[PDB]
Write a protein that binds this DNA or RNA. Structure first.
Lengths: 101, 97, 91, 80
DNA sequence: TGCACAGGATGTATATATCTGACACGTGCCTGGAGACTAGGGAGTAATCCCCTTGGCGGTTAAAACGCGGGGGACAGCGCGTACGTG
DNA sequence: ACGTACGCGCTGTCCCCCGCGTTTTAACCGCCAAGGGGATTACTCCCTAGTCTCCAGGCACGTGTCAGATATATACATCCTGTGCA
């Protein structure tokens, strides 16, 4: 496939066929699914390394949704990117007010 | 000599207890009869899957938690620790509703 | 019946980043909803951005300015750098 | 007949403990119960809309997730 | 008669065989990977014209800026009691 | 059922921004006429991918196998009881 010669992991044919059958435009370029798999691979690698270190903080070798919830909410760009997204079984942040102490 | 806590202690350890738990705080059967009750007058003789009930209960629980946090900050702005009805109307209206 | 997911790809990038920590099934479904959502984000922004220029062709320019417009400057900067690196290395 | 009273007062007290609330007044359970009563109509009405459009007698998880898709909430997890 | 002792009758952590659950490996039919023909949509250019500037003198006007008096409203101190905290 | 303590009502304080009069400046006009570059319209090639096509192969699926939790022999281990004694 053309993903290995370009340094990609996600396939180009599935994204290109999904853009063809997704009713977006008449003509589809050849570098657009490569760019899309590059952006999705970098972002998915970012969530994988942030949730991976968040799983490394609580001394567990498995990723629970609370680690992904704290990994997304603890980052500013992920909270600004996704502010309305509700994560199931992720819990909330330990936010304790100062005046209630 | 009875052993009693002062008012304001058990709420803090209830915050420490429930804030570490990801479980649902609403039972399945009153939410089931409630969802079927709202679904009664819309379309008669409907069916519900075993899924898609903890999704409504999950979004209701987390959305109500965020509403209690925004309303809690609204009660913090009033320089008191008690939540009032005008805090729910204030934090409900100021979110765009 | 057949279904399509990103299990082996997320497991492969997992083996590329930290090949010790495993992933649960539910968080894998959350990541599938994440990639499936951002795919509709950049795809829909590419559709409207292609509709704004009175053109019927979607190229890497629309994905580049679309990523530059819907993301913060860090994620759009490194995503634009790595994306143009993968595209220019591909061509 | 009156399944809105199934939500107990210690349940709203525990949901207030999740939000960081120390002291709770009397009308909070009635106001929260009314907001929940409007919310379940606001989501459930769209669920009956997509269920009626889908030519189905049973509501699925895709009906709930796609029902919350257009409202900007984007509920993940079950049926994504 | 008061007393220590040898062996049974029950417990109890300890070690061993056994029951789910999830990671790992071996396939093959609906996917991708790739070759060639067409052509219209994209890249490039030649006037164009049209509203948009370039730089700074004065006279005057309406709007912006300053200044003080003080009045009423924000704000601190303090007692009460009943309404939720705790059991 | 008890309880106690913070929301609330009341009172005294003081101070800070509103109302209005006086000072200072931003902008429009007259002079005195000129060009200028950037989207627009029209024209003209040119070459990237839709479409058709066939060849290959790979990730969803089925099975092997160990990790972790589970239930049960077992070798002593502590009260109880005959039981013989000084």
């Amino acid at each position: 496939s053309r993903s290995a010669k370009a340094g990609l992991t996600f396939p180009v044919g599935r994204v290109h066929r999904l853009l063809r059958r997704g009713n977006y435009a008449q003509r589809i370029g050849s570098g657009a699914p490569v760019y899309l798999t590059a952006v999705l691979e970098y972002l998915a690698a970012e969530i994988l390394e942030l949730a991976g270190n968040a799983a490394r903080d609580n001394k567990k070798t498995r990723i629970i949704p609370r680690h992904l919830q704290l990994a997304i909410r603890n980052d500013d760009e992920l909270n600004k990117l996704l502010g309305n997204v509700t994560i199931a079984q992720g819990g909330v942040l330990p936010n304790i007010h100062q005046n209630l102490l | 000599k009875p052993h009693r806590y002062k008012p304001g202690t058990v709420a803090l350890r209830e915050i420490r207890r429930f804030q570490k738990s990801t479980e649902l705080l609403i039972r399945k059967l009153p939410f089931q009869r409630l969802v079927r009750e709202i679904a009664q007058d819309f379309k008669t003789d409907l069916r519900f899957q075993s899924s898609a009930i903890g999704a409504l209960q999950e979004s209701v629980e987390a959305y109500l938690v965020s509403l209690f946090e925004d309303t809690n900050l609204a009660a913090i702005h009033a320089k008191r620790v008690t939540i009032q009805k005008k805090e729910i109307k204030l934090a409900r209206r100021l979110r765009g509703e | 019946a057949r279904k399509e997911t990103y299990s082996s790809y997320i497991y492969k990038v997992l083996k590329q980043t930290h090949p010790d920590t495993g992933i649960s099934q539910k968080s894998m479904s959350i990541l599938n909803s994440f990639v499936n959502d951002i795919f509709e984000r950049i795809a829909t922004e590419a559709s409207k951005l292609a509709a704004y220029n009175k053109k019927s062709t979607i190229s890497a320019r629309e994905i580049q300015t679309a990523v530059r417009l819907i993301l913060p400057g860090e994620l759009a900067k490194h995503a634009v750098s790595e994306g143009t690196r993968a595209v220019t290395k591909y061509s | 007949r009156d399944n809105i009273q199934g939500i107990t007062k210690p349940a709203i007290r525990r949901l207030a403990r999740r939000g960081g609330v120390k002291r709770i007044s009397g009308l909070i359970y009635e106001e929260v119960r009314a907001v929940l009563k409007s919310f379940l109509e606001s989501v459930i009405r769209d669920s009956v809309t997509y269920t009626e459009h889908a030519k189905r007698k049973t509501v699925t998880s895709l009906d709930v997730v796609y029902a919350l898709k257009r409202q900007g909430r984007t509920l993940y997890g079950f049926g994504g």
